[PDB]
Design a protein around this motif. Structure first.
Motif, PDB file in Angstrom:
ATOM      1  N   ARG A  85       0.854  -1.160   0.000  1.00 55.23           N
ATOM      2  CA  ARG A  85       0.000   0.000   0.000  1.00 55.23           C
ATOM      3  C   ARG A  85       0.914   1.243   0.000  1.00 55.23           C
ATOM      4  NH1 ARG A  85      -5.361   0.226   1.425  1.00 55.23           N
ATOM      5  NH2 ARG A  85      -5.215  -1.825   2.471  1.00 55.23           N
ATOM      6  N   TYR A  86       1.950   1.197   0.829  1.00 57.95           N
ATOM      7  CA  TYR A  86       2.909   2.255   1.004  1.00 57.95           C
ATOM      8  C   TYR A  86       3.794   2.416  -0.248  1.00 57.95           C
ATOM      9  CZ  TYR A  86       5.748   5.616   3.443  1.00 57.95           C
ATOM     10  OH  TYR A  86       6.383   6.805   3.820  1.00 57.95           O
ATOM     11  N   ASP A  87       4.332   1.307  -0.717  1.00 56.59           N
ATOM     12  CA  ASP A  87       5.201   1.294  -1.869  1.00 56.59           C
ATOM     13  C   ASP A  87       4.498   1.734  -3.138  1.00 56.59           C
ATOM     14  OD1 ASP A  87       7.477   0.558  -0.497  1.00 56.59           O
ATOM     15  OD2 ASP A  87       7.094  -1.585  -0.755  1.00 56.59           O
TER      16      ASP A  87
ATOM     17  N   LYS B  16       1.995   3.785  -3.339  1.00 57.23           N
ATOM     18  CA  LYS B  16       1.843   5.249  -3.208  1.00 57.23           C
ATOM     19  C   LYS B  16       3.124   5.966  -3.609  1.00 57.23           C
ATOM     20  CE  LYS B  16      -0.545   6.219   0.225  1.00 57.23           C
ATOM     21  NZ  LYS B  16      -1.755   5.791  -0.586  1.00 57.23           N
ATOM     22  N   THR B  17       4.258   5.451  -3.151  1.00 51.28           N
ATOM     23  CA  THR B  17       5.560   6.009  -3.505  1.00 51.28           C
ATOM     24  C   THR B  17       5.787   5.976  -4.999  1.00 51.28           C
ATOM     25  OG1 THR B  17       6.452   5.350  -1.382  1.00 51.28           O
ATOM     26  CG2 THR B  17       8.012   5.843  -3.048  1.00 51.28           C
TER      27      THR B  17
ATOM     28  N   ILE C 207       3.538   5.712  -7.463  1.00 53.31           N
ATOM     29  CA  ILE C 207       2.626   6.637  -8.120  1.00 53.31           C
ATOM     30  C   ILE C 207       3.135   8.076  -8.046  1.00 53.31           C
ATOM     31  CG2 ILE C 207       0.322   7.667  -8.025  1.00 53.31           C
ATOM     32  CD1 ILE C 207      -0.555   4.738  -7.060  1.00 53.31           C
ATOM     33  N   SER C 208       3.666   8.463  -6.884  1.00 57.71           N
ATOM     34  CA  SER C 208       4.127   9.850  -6.684  1.00 57.71           C
ATOM     35  C   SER C 208       5.234  10.215  -7.642  1.00 57.71           C
ATOM     36  CB  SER C 208       4.595  10.065  -5.251  1.00 57.71           C
ATOM     37  OG  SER C 208       3.479  10.076  -4.376  1.00 57.71           O
TER      38      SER C 208
ATOM     39  N   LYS D  74      -0.396   8.669 -13.482  1.00 56.05           N
ATOM     40  CA  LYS D  74      -0.701   8.512 -12.067  1.00 56.05           C
ATOM     41  C   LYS D  74      -2.117   7.971 -11.847  1.00 56.05           C
ATOM     42  CE  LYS D  74       2.115  12.452 -10.523  1.00 56.05           C
ATOM     43  NZ  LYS D  74       3.121  11.793  -9.701  1.00 56.05           N
ATOM     44  N   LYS D  75      -3.109   8.514 -12.541  1.00 55.61           N
ATOM     45  CA  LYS D  75      -4.499   8.204 -12.188  1.00 55.61           C
ATOM     46  C   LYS D  75      -4.827   6.761 -12.500  1.00 55.61           C
ATOM     47  CE  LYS D  75      -5.919  13.013 -12.363  1.00 55.61           C
ATOM     48  NZ  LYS D  75      -5.423  13.781 -13.535  1.00 55.61           N
TER      49      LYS D  75
ATOM     50  N   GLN E 256      -3.181   4.550  -9.931  1.00 54.70           N
ATOM     51  CA  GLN E 256      -3.911   4.708  -8.682  1.00 54.70           C
ATOM     52  C   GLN E 256      -5.238   3.935  -8.679  1.00 54.70           C
ATOM     53  OE1 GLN E 256      -5.640   8.438  -7.676  1.00 54.70           O
ATOM     54  NE2 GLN E 256      -4.458   8.537  -5.751  1.00 54.70           N
TER      55      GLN E 256
ATOM     56  N   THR F  65      -4.421   0.268  -8.342  1.00 48.52           N
ATOM     57  CA  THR F  65      -3.973   0.005  -6.994  1.00 48.52           C
ATOM     58  C   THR F  65      -5.179  -0.065  -6.047  1.00 48.52           C
ATOM     59  OG1 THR F  65      -1.774   0.910  -7.343  1.00 48.52           O
ATOM     60  CG2 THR F  65      -2.523   0.902  -5.122  1.00 48.52           C
ATOM     61  N   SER F  66      -6.126   0.866  -6.224  1.00 43.43           N
ATOM     62  CA  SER F  66      -7.304   0.922  -5.363  1.00 43.43           C
ATOM     63  C   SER F  66      -8.117  -0.367  -5.527  1.00 43.43           C
ATOM     64  CB  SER F  66      -8.136   2.194  -5.666  1.00 43.43           C
ATOM     65  OG  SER F  66      -9.332   2.180  -4.945  1.00 43.43           O
TER      66      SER F  66
END
Ligand SMILES: [Zn+2]
Ligand SMILES: [Zn+2]
Length: 129
Positions: free
Chosen positions: A66-68, A70-71, A73-74, A81-82, A85, A88-89
């Motif tokens: 979940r953390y990775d 996000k990293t 995507i950033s 990105k979208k 994301q 991932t969701s």
């Protein structure tokens, strides 16, 4: 369990919780691929009805992913990105539902959500490359 304790990161180049070290985008993507492989290895726990084992392992993998993701995507280009994301969701929804299936000790729901998670992992891996 579910939410990890975040410890300090490497320098630039509590009861029943896992620990997470934030990583830079490149190392985060690699750790995501590893954690994805490890999630798909929970099938053994489902088949043997080893529900706590399933939950604990899944929560560890989910904590990192979940953390990775996000990293990752950033650091992605704006135009990518979208989509990542959204993928991932969707993956986290199926992971959360697999955890839910384990909580209620349901083989049928666990198999269902594990199957979705396979597909959802693949879509994320195709974007990570
Ligand atoms: Zn099975
Ligand atoms: Zn259910």
């Amino acid at each position: 369990e579910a939410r990890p304790i975040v410890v300090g990161p490497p320098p630039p180049l509590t009861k029943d919780r896992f620990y997470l070290q934030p990583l830079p985008p490149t190392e985060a993507a690699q750790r995501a691929k590893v954690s994805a492989s490890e999630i798909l290895n929970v099938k053994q726990f489902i088949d043997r009805k080893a529900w706590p084992s399933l939950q604990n392992d899944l929560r560890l993998r989910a904590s990192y992913l979940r953390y990775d993701l996000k990293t990752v995507i950033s650091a992605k280009p704006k135009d990518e990105k979208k989509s990542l994301q959204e993928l991932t969701s969707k993956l986290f929804s199926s992971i959360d539902n697999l955890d839910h299936a384990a909580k209620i000790k349901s083989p049928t729901e666990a198999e269902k959500y594990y199957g979705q998670t396979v597909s959802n992992i693949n879509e994320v891996l195709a974007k990570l490359g």
